[PDB]
Amino acid sequence: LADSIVPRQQWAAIEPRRQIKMNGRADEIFLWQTGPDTCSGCLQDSSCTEQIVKALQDADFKEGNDDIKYNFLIDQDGVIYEGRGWGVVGQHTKGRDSHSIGVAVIGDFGKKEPSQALQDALSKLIICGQAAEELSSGARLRTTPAMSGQAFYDMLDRCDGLCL
Amino acid sequence: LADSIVPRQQWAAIEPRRQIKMNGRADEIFLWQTGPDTCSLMGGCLQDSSCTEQIVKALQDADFKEGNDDIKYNFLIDQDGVIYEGRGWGVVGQHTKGRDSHSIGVAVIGDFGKKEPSQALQDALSKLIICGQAAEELSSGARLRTTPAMSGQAFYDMLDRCDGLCL
């Protein structure tokens, strides 16, 4: 908490091969998980989650995407990573990328719920985005078990949103 | 909580005479109170009513008259937690003589010589900084600087015993 969002240059990101500007404020936030297999310890590691971001971008390329598919990413220790950033249409939620923000939580949460550190980072990213008119003040957080993992989904269901 | 910062145009701001950009993040936040004499201009209002937007405009007018390039502060916060955009992020203000080049000036609307600021105002203050830091506009260790003369005894006393805003 209290740090800055890690910019594209910190994790040595490649310029995108195409960047489509978003038509004003996003009013939705789609939460996805990178997967229990992301590894291809380093759940926090010593700045290991930073090369994972770099890698995810590389993966997203071979897949035909214009750049890493998410607008932001968050690791289990609470550090936020700038993906496509604010104002750019991502390629994360088929057919719904145009007016939403796509966030990816690094790791799998099909069995274990997210750390309070990760949850806090997410709440922060939302509050700050809204403060700066990047996100609509009513933006709903959307996800499903298939998207962010049963453990993550179950948690939002219990705390009617992020816990505490 | 989820509300955006109020942009210049929402309070009918007139464009700056000149806008000087700021090289590098700001490493310090200077706190100033608009004073007990804030209700002066026309003569509750300082509370929830949005008469506050009219006060921000009034301040700008006062600052122009004195020769400033625009309203003196980068941001202003009222007692209900509403944050208003002054000069905004990345621009040098004219709020703390000699120290404007690498800092952010925040004015708190009211008189805090005797009464501490509402909790709503503190949280907004807290949010502004944290979001400034997240967006890399303020350094990660930026110090909230002030004195009783600048922001009122009551405000100074509170930050002084909590080494910054109280949790």
List the helices and strands and how they pair.
The structure is a homodimer.
Chain A: E1 26-33, H1 49-62, E2 72-74, E3 80-82, E4 100-105, H2 116-131, E5 135-142, H3 145-148, H4 150-158
Parallel strand pairs in A: 1-4, 1-5, 2-4
Antiparallel strand pairs in A: 2-3
Report on the architecture of this protein.
- The structure is a homodimer.
- In chain A, 26% of the residues lie in helices and 17% in strands.
- The first copy, chain A, is built from 4 helices and 5 strands.
- The first copy, chain A, has a 5-stranded mixed β-sheet, covered by helices on one side.
- The longest helix of chain A is centred in the last third of the chain and has 16 residues, at 116-131.
- Chain A is globular, with a radius of gyration of 15 Å.
- Chains A and B meet through helix 2 of A and helix 2 of B.
- The PDB classes it as immune system.
- The entry lists the keywords PGRP-Hd, Alvinella pompejana, immune system, thermophile, model system.
- It forms a dimeric assembly.
Keywords:
alpha/beta, homodimer, globular, immune system, PGRP-Hd, Lysozyme-like, 5-stranded mixed sheet, 164 residues
Quick summary of this structure?
Chain A is α/β, with parallel strands linked by helices. Helix content of chain A is 26%, strand content 17%. Chain A has a single domain (1-164), classed as Lysozyme-like.
